[PDB]
Symmetry: C3
Subunit: 348 residues, 3 copies
Amino acid sequence: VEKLPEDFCANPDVAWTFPKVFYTSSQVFEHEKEAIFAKSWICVAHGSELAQPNDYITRKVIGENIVIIRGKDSVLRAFYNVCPHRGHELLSGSGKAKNVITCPYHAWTFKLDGSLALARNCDHVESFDKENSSMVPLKVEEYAGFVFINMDENATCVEDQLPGFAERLNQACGVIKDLKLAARFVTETPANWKVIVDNYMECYHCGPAHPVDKYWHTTHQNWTLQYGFATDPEFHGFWTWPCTMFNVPPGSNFMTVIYEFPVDAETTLQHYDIYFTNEELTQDQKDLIEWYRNVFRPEDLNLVESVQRGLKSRGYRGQGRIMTDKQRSGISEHGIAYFQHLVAQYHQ
Amino acid sequence: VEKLPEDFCANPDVAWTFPKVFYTSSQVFEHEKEAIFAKSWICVAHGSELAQPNDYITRKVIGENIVIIRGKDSVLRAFYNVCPHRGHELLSGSGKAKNVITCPYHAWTFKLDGSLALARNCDHVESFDKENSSMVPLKVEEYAGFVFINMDENATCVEDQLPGFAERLNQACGVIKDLKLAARFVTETPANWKVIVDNYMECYHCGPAHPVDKYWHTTHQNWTLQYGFATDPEFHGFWTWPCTMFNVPPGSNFMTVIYEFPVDAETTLQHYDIYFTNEELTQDQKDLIEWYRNVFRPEDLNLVESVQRGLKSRGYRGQGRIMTDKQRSGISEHGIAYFQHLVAQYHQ
Amino acid sequence: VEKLPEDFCANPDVAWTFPKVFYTSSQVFEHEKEAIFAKSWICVAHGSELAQPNDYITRKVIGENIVIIRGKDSVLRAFYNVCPHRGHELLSGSGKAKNVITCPYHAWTFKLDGSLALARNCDHVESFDKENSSMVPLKVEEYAGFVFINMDENATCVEDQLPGFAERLNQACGVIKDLKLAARFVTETPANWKVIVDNYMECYHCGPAHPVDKYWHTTHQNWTLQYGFATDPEFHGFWTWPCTMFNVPPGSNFMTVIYEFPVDAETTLQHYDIYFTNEELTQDQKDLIEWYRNVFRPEDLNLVESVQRGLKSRGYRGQGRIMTDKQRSGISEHGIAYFQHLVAQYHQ
Ligand SMILES: C[N+](C)(C)CCCC(=O)O
Ligand SMILES: C[N+](C)(C)CCCC(=O)O
Ligand SMILES: C[N+](C)(C)CCCC(=O)O
Ligand SMILES: C[N+](C)(C)CCCC(=O)O
Ligand SMILES: C[N+](C)(C)CCCC(=O)O
Ligand SMILES: C[N+](C)(C)CCCC(=O)O
Ligand code: FES
Ligand code: FES
Ligand code: FES
Ligand SMILES: [Fe+3]
Ligand SMILES: [Fe+3]
Ligand SMILES: [Fe+3]
């Protein structure tokens, strides 16, 4: 039971990162898994993957295999991807469901709303409860053009978690509804999910790690915006609680999105999604995909993997200095302090 | 220390599988390892692998490397496959031993009864005890044409564990002594040993998982028999405590046997052995081997691997309903309840 | 908290190896990691790898990535290979450093003495401490022609740990300063570090495991010497606390050195280094390297890997007899008792 003070990182001008145990402890991870990831809205996809009846996707986060499915009735729902009879998985990959889901094991059959449609011989089983033998649901919400799930069925909506975010994202990219998935990079990353957020929250490393008429990192309520000018081309980098990042590069007509799906204390599954409105890509778009694939993302992944190894050394003396400057300049690290102050509230 | 009630699954008509912790907990596994697998008779082979003087085999179960060896004197014995000097392994694989076993490390030499024959310079070591520096034995018994070991040297015989089993197996296949190993499939299966037993104990999935003038699943004392008619061809499927299954398909002139050698809470080493009386196989027999290899066994392994993943989900709500019908029909799951009631007696 | 008596193995004539838990327990390993490996001098290299200004090497031991670097000023130093800003690793492999070390993450720049030279925007960070943001040092000492590190900065010199060793090693090989690394075999060995030492400390297995006008194994203070005659060619095998072994074969003009860098209870990284004074190898030397590579070392590695597996069996009854003879002959195992008596002093 590692603990942090309430004002941890409350003053970004004099602040340090978490004691290293928070990036490595399996007990810390189990606490964050239940207190954060099982109670927060988790972004899983852009709405375009789920726009048509019978569309489905699958996702894996904190050990939970989830199916998100647009019903025959065009209603979006989410379920745990596990049969309520004896635990076989139900669907794999993504695509179009048939009009019923059939369990591979004993062929219990479910409508796309999760209701049990047919369970062989169940009229002969004593005290069989057909309603309450349905697929088990999660909360799902379409917000800001993206799709969020929540394992806490008592949760309130995404706007309560990210006040003002949808409004500001739509003022960064006006064509979100027209975006389509152009490429996805899936990486099982050997770093704690918070190291990856840390790395996003600063541009201190842009230049020395990646070979702008002012850059402002403003904090909001459970999200932040890195904003500036590269006409007058704007760029936007949004971090949202707990760990989904939305990038709107200069031009504001496409997006990249980083989805972090934590696995354990030192492992995070990442989706890096690239979205364009074209369904047939231009050469510029194809080259951009290859550049993200071969250069930009390998740089960022090598960084977090090396940091995760290095922070375990006894020569790394507990914590690292957050290099915040008084002027909140473009190379100031103060965004890390805002993130870590929010995390600290879950370790009281 | 997870616990179960004495009457757990005592009424198969209204029964559920174990709470999921029993399929996943390393503490549950350590308890079952010592209370079940280190005290029960464990089937390891058909007698034909060990029929001649100097024949030996090796097996690995619950972390124990065991050698079973027919001596020069034609007496069957079993030992731990570890040198009593400083712990080097003694034999590997299976085949014919030489007339003494020589340790690869310092060449202590043992007769095939485990007695130390020669230990270099041991007459010069103070208080060296040559008897009690022999290989360490286990109990072994030839029963029903198969070979069983027991790590508990105070154990009584296999018949006390499986009353009536040998008598009934010989009334299923009359030629067991003439069988010879025709093929063996070795698989390290990522499922708890009890998931694999569960899967064997029901034919609810035959049809939906594997593309009969009545089928009866009768329980006995620590074993069960699935029996019916496919002349009047009979079929037999025996499960025996703790987890060896003997199949005698229609025709009753060959057998397949499933040996489960648990490794840890989520890992079980399986041998799937196919036995025919012919030493030169017919084309029907060769095709059957390839069908078991490419189709039938991959189906059954995919099932248990998916169940092991799915039962860990928080959307799998603890336990699964055992679909027993009042008529004990061929698709009734009641065999699972008998098995799990027996397991529960070890978790008091 | 496993414990051993003070006189454990104090009488080699009647002695047994550690109870098996000391070779397998992660708690025992964590204790030895902090009480032995973080407080003792650890040999890492021959001086020839570090002889010139800007020469550096890297090593990994008990989870610590260490850089040893000869400065521009020709002073030998050692540091933890981790940036003090936010934990990125600094250098990899071995070779010649540039005149400053630049962190790949945010390009903090260090002189080769570890001093911070430049940290971007640090004059704008409140209460930034530039001295105490340097690389974190370890102790390093050149002793007997080899290079030792110590994580305990209060440690005294290598001679206090190994009294008389340098003097005796120089009386085994008179040309240590002229040796150069000719080959290195790196192996991640699945055996506890003490099994590997045990194996070195006896010649009971030479002959039965590896297809001499007296052989004497004399103990000193934290090191031992295996000495004899194969003119009158001498051979020397030194073991030094905790686990570096120095071999000077007949002829006394070359050396091999075994470096053990423990990883966890059942894993040890080994360097097997072969040193000759020639920089252009003779055919005899090339063949010797290939013989060590293909025959001699695979024998010794197979032995310790099999022992590590075998000692976990319940058929290995706790401990093994150390086969010491009254005459302390060449096949006497008494060297194991001296080593294990020293280890026992850390488990009081
Ligand atoms: C507690 N905290 C994080 C504000 C300061 C810790 C002091 C240090 O960095 O060594
Ligand atoms: C926004 N920024 C500059 C901090 C990082 C960009 C994230 C990317 O998509 O990898
Ligand atoms: C205790 N038991 C297994 C008989 C019934 C458990 C109730 C349930 O299935 O939720
Ligand atoms: C007997 N039955 C039908 C439950 C399963 C057959 C087992 C097989 O050999 O794989
Ligand atoms: C305590 N000790 C190691 C000296 C003797 C242990 C007795 C035995 O080997 O069984
Ligand atoms: C010295 N001795 C004979 C015990 C072992 C030789 C070690 C070797 O270099 O592998
Ligand atoms: S596990 Fe799905 S129908 Fe049985
Ligand atoms: S370990 Fe078998 S003779 Fe030494
Ligand atoms: S981690 Fe080295 S400069 Fe930031
Ligand atoms: Fe970056
Ligand atoms: Fe089956
Ligand atoms: Fe050797």
